[PDB]
């Protein structure tokens, strides 16, 4: 059961990307809820059109807004969920600063403090691990 409520949602693979009533775009992996991104306003998932390389959102308007799904983050975290911590580390060169620390914290929550230590950019997170 997932913490952030699903106002609307979409399945990208077996991973569920949904909007939340917090305006949070989160994805469900593992039975764990991660925030892929923050929505600034209330948005609904029209669908994911591979052509545009985008997820198409709409406001109150019958027009288009687009969010590309942050696949590198999602794949890091998904791999972590599966208990493929090394695999998620291959993703890490393309996870930036603070995101490596976060993804590391994901890795850690699932378990393996050390692999999380190598990816975490932040020294403090390394130091605690």
């Amino acid at each position: 059961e997932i913490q952030e409520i699903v106002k609307t949602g979409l399945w990208v693979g077996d991973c569920f990307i949904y909007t939340s009533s917090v305006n949070r775009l989160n994805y469900y992996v593992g039975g764990e809820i991660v925030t892929i991104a923050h929505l600034d306003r209330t948005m609904y998932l029209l669908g994911y059109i591979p052509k545009d390389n985008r997820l198409y959102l709409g406001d109150k308007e019958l027009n288009i807004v687009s969010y590309s799904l942050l696949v590198s983050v999602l794949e890091y975290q998904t791999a972590v969920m599966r208990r493929d911590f090394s695999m998620a580390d291959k993703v890490l060169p393309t996870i930036p600063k603070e995101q490596r620390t976060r993804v590391a914290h994901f890795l850690e929550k699932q378990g393996f403090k050390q692999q999380a230590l190598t990816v975490s950019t932040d020294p403090e997170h390394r130091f605690e691990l």
Binding site: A37, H38, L39, D40, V65, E98
Partner: protein
């Protein structure tokens, strides 16, 4: 009867009259005069007589009212007994079938901590043991607790009477309505019972259970009370880097600044903090959490930066919110402050792009050029951005608009040596339409330093040199400037050498060159031509000449410490500068004594006379800001009496209507014309009345400006520094030596103190004590100090002026 202290004779009459309304009104009038604090015992027998047994609630309620605010004091109609006229027939009142009279009676009776009513209040819990309302049961737990408080911490108040004696507190927990007067010192079993009650709550009652016993294992269980404790409990379980995202704190918090812009400004601050925790350099201060709203994905839709743009402000919302917002742009994003300040400054500073950011008032324009430019001086990357934007500033092409632009950029070149070669050609352009000083000054400096780069210069300079506008300060700036950089690298009909010729003529010489200069006579008296005239050893060439000076920057020039800088964005700074950050014969003999830190005025009162002075009373008075902490109290001053009587003294009070002199001391005795005489004990001054307060350099400076302090005296025995005599004496005329206004060196080094006080005289008091202690071969007057003084109409200025000399008193009786 709002407050009328003499009316007690009419009240007695009104109190019994055979008309119930009149009696009620009378008793009511007594209540209102006592509450204010006025005369009441005369009436007592009358008051007490009608009301006593009756179940008729209104008079009874009124009398019941008067027994909790003065019962002890009033004694005509009551006197002292165990079953007083407060409670004797109010045992009937307690035992009436109507809940209101019983309830009321119980409630006042048990409320008193009176010992002359201790017994009657104890079985007074009977009146509310049966609970006809929520009010009756609450009234009971509070009354048992009040009985417990009133000398019954043991077995008189603890068990049950027939249902409560300290057990309503237990009962309340399981009953339909709760309220626990059990906060301290009461039954353990009830405390335990309240815990059980957290679940089976009554909400008002829950606030009573909760003050006693807090922290839950749950999320909640319901109701505002539990909810209010809960945010406290949450802050515990995550203290770390503020709350960050405010919990249930948010609801009270808005009202905390209802006046009206300040809430948004505050809210904006939290929202900025929350975004991210950055590097936290100089004005990069965003705390809270590192990731919780990120910054800056390239797939995030419609992005974080949209909210970040609000914070970049010209005033885009209103001024209070503006000042907060500019700091807040700087705080989330920059390198320090420099990066986001350049962007922000680019928007604010004057252009040809938008005319909603340009203005024809010269100082503001200039300041805005300096703010943009200070970012370069701070950080390199900004130099490259600044120079092309500066040329856009110029493109406005008003005399003045060019002018301001030229003035900063020229400073930037002093910092930024042969890096801004490119700008010179742009800078000349608007130099020809001219009505001001500033344009000439600045242009002549760019065109002058930059000569190697260009070759135009006779042509550009010459239209201006034979044009008019305002030219004082033009002279100074052109004087050091015109030749510079490379000896022969220009030519239009005047090479660099013609320029040195010109440069010299403009400074103070004479020469046909650029169709003569506009003026020659220099700016402010000290500057003159001569230094530069001597100079240009090697004709306008980088060596040890004007060029050197021009392509170098005076002292250290780095940061935003205000060394070729101006410290952020010019509009935000005005607000920061504003912020001061202020923090019958009678004989007396007397001395002041202190034992065990008790300060007392010793007085001895002497009757050297054989005559009668009986009727002798001694008083110390409250004059104004002087006060008695206890007058001398002996009934002494009798035939050939010597007595020592101690009058305790205070220095701090509020002004009384009687005289304002030294210390008044009053002895009374026999005599009927001068029953009271005023005679003196030793000196206390007018100066006491001043109240000490302090200033910082900003408050001192503001007040200096605010009102004149020209007035000076020189005070002897200011030979010494600030710290010694001068501080101690200044203290006694309630002043204090704070911050400096000095400028010390090997030739300078008068000690300077900035003084402040805020006198209870309708004035402040300020002064500067300058101590002329020789740090030169020719001192003012040697050791001594001149105190420059003021007060707000300089009526206390004078107090400062002489109370920094000397001051001492002693006696040895």
């Amino acid at each position: 009867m709002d407050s009328e202290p003499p009316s007690e004779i009419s009240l007695k009459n009104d109190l019994e009259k055979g008309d119930v309304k009149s009696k009620t009104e009378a008793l009511k009038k007594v209540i209102i005069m006592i509450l204010n604090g006025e005369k009441l015992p005369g009436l007592l027998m009358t008051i007490i007589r009608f009301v006593l047994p009756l179940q008729d609630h209104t008079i009874k309620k009124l009398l019941l009212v008067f027994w909790e605010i003065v019962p002890k004091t009033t004694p005509d109609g009551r006197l002292l007994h165990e079953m007083i006229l407060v409670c004797d027939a109010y045992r009937k009142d307690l035992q009436h079938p109507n809940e209101f009279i019983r309830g009321s009676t119980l409630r006042f009776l048990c409320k008193l901590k009176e010992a002359e009513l201790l017994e009657p209040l104890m079985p007074a819990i009977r009146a509310c043991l049966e609970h006809r309302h929520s009010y009756v049961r609450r009234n009971a737990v509070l009354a048992i607790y009040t009985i417990y408080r009133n000398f019954e911490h043991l077995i008189p108040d603890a068990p049950e009477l027939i249902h409560d004696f300290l057990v309503n507190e237990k009962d309340a927990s399981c009953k339909r309505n709760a309220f626990m007067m059990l906060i301290h010192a009461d039954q353990d079993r009830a405390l335990d019972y309240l815990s059980t009650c957290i679940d089976q709550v009554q909400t008002f009652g829950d606030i009573l259970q909760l003050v006693i016993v807090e922290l839950i294992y749950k999320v909640c269980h319901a109701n505002p009370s539990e909810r209010a404790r809960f945010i406290r409990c949450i802050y515990n379980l995550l203290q770390s880097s503020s709350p960050a995202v405010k919990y249930e704190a948010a609801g009270t918090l808005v009202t905390l600044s209802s006046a009206p812009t300040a809430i948004k400004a505050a809210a904006q601050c939290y929202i900025d903090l929350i975004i991210k925790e950055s590097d936290n350099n100089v004005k990069l201060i965003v705390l809270d959490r590192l990731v919780e709203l990120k910054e800056h994905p390239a797939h995030e839709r419609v992005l974080q930066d949209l909210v970040m743009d609000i914070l970049r402000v010209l005033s885009t919302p209103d001024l209070e919110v503006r000042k907060k917002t500019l700091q807040l742009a700087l705080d989330l994003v920059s390198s320090r402050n420099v990066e986001e300040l350049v962007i922000v400054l680019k928007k604010e500073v004057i252009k040809t792009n938008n005319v909603s950011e340009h203005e024809d008032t010269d100082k503001y324009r200039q300041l805005l050029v300096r703010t943009l430019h200070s970012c370069s001086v701070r950080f390199p990357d900004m130099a490259a951005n600044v120079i092309p934007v500066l040329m856009e500033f110029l493109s406005d092409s008003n005399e003045a608009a060019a002018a301001d632009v030229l003035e900063f950029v020229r400073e930037a070149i002093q910092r930024f040596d042969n890096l801004r070669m490119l700008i010179v050609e742009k800078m000349l352009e608007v130099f020809h339409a001219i009505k001001s000083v500033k344009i000439y000054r600045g242009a002549l400096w760019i065109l002058g330093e930059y000569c190697s780069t260009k070759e135009d210069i006779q042509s550009v300079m010459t239209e201006v040199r034979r044009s008019l506008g305002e030219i004082p300060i033009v002279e100074s700036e052109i004087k050091k400037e015109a030749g510079e950089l490379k000896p022969e690298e220009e030519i239009t009909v005047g090479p660099v050498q013609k320029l040195v010729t010109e440069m010299g003529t403009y400074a103070t010489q004479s020469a046909l060159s650029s169709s003569r200069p506009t003026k020659k006579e220099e700016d402010r008296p000290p500057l003159r031509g001569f230094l530069l005239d001597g100079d240009f050893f090697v004709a306008a060439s980088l060596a040890t000449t004007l060029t050197k000076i021009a392509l170098r920057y005076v002292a250290l020039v780095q940061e935003k410490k205000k060394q070729n800088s101006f410290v952020a964005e010019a509009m935000l700074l005005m607000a920061t500068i504003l912020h001061l950050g202020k923090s019958d014969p009678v004989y007396a003999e007397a001395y002041v004594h202190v034992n065990q830190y008790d300060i007392v005025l010793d007085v001895l009162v002497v009757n050297q006379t054989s005559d009668t002075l009986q009727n002798c009373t001694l008083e110390l008075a409250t004059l104004g800001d002087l006060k008695l902490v206890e007058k001398p109290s002996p009934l002494t001053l009798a035939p050939h009496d010597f007595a020592n009587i101690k009058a305790n003294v205070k220095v701090a009070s509020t002004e009384n209507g009687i005289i304002f002199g030294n210390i008044v001391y009053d002895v009374s005795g026999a005599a009927s014309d001068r029953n009271c005489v005023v005679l003196s004990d030793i000196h206390i001054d007018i100066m006491d009345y001043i109240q000490p307060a302090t200033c910082t350099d900003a408050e001192f400076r503001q007040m200096w400006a605010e009102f004149e302090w020209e007035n000076k005296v020189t005070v002897n025995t200011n030979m010494t520094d600030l710290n010694d005599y001068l501080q101690h004496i200044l203290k006694s005329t309630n002043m204090k030596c704070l911050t400096p206004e000095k400028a010390l060196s090997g030739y300078c080094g008068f000690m300077a103190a900035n003084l402040y006080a805020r006198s209870i005289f309708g004035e402040d008091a300020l002064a500067n004590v300058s101590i002329e202690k020789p740090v030169h071969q020719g001192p003012d007057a040697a050791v001594t100090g001149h105190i420059r003084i003021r007060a707000k109409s300089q009526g206390m200025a004078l107090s400062l002026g002489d109370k920094i000399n000397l001051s001492q008193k002693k006696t040895s009786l």
